[PDB]
Amino acid sequence: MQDAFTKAIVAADLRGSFLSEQELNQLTNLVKESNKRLDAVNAITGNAAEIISDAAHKLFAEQTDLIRPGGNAYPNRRMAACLRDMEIILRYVSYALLAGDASVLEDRCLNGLKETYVALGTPTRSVARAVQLMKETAIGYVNSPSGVTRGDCSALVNEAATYFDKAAASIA
């Protein structure tokens, strides 16, 4: 598994080199913003259930097809599987966000996922949408939390978004 430092190290090694002063300071900045990062990961963990629930309510509000017999979130067994997958993806997105690298998300979650769903008959476009809704709400929480020091988290909100967007793209 990689994190943002480990990634630097692998690229350096492929040159046969000690880390460039370029790469060093990029990583010094990561350490600089790490308290914000911890709050951002904490924002997701602290509202995981609601993020999934709210995404869910809204997914089925939009797409009643899945809720009706013949639909991929019917009966209870399938809805529980769908709720479970929403959690799994939100979980690996939070891991990527602590790590500063998408690899755990791509390697443990996204790799093969689309082909799984197609084999199952699970409508990937609906799954992509459920991921887009989790993103909206998750970022909502990253941006408006309990008594965190005021500052600018937009860099981290972007990065979190790209992890949500990776997952969506990979699946649709």
Ligand X SMILES: CCC1=C(C)/C(=C/C2=NC(=C\c3[nH]c(/C=C4\NC(=O)[C@H](C)[C@H]4CC)c(C)c3CCC(=O)O)/C(CCC(=O)O)=C2C)NC1=O
- Which positions lie near ligand X, rule CB under 6 A? 35-36, 38-40, 42, 57, 60, 66-67, 72-76, 78-79, 81-82, 85-86, 88-89, 108-109, 113, 116, 120, 122-123, 126-127, 130, 142-145, 148-151, 153, 156
* One of 21, 22, 28, 70 touching a copy of itself (CB under 8 A): 70
Q: Which is nearer to ligand X, 22 or 76 (CB)?
A: 76
Q: How many whole angstroms separate alpha carbon 149 and alpha carbon 57?
A: 32
When the beta carbons of 5 and 98 are compared against ligand X, the nearer one is 98
Residues 142, 148, 151, 154, Cα dihedral to 10°: -10
To ligand X, the closest distance from the beta carbon of 46 in angstroms equals 9
Report how far Cα 170 is from the mean position of its chain's Cα atoms. 12
On whether the CB atoms of residues 171 and 114 are closer than 8 A, the answer is yes
Site string for another protein, 113-152 (x = CB under 8 A): xxxxxxxx---x---------------------xxxx---
What secondary structure letter does DSSP report for 102? S
Contact 139, 160 (CB under 8 A): yes
Task: Say how far residue 101 (Cα) sits from the centre of its chain.
Answer: 11
83 annotated ligand binder: yes
| Nearest distance in Å: CB 116, another protein | 4
Residues in the chain: 172
Per the listing, tokens 């197609």 go with: 118
Give the annotated binding-site residues for (2R,3E)-phycocyanobilin. Answer: 35, 39, 72, 77-78, 82-88, 149, 151, 153
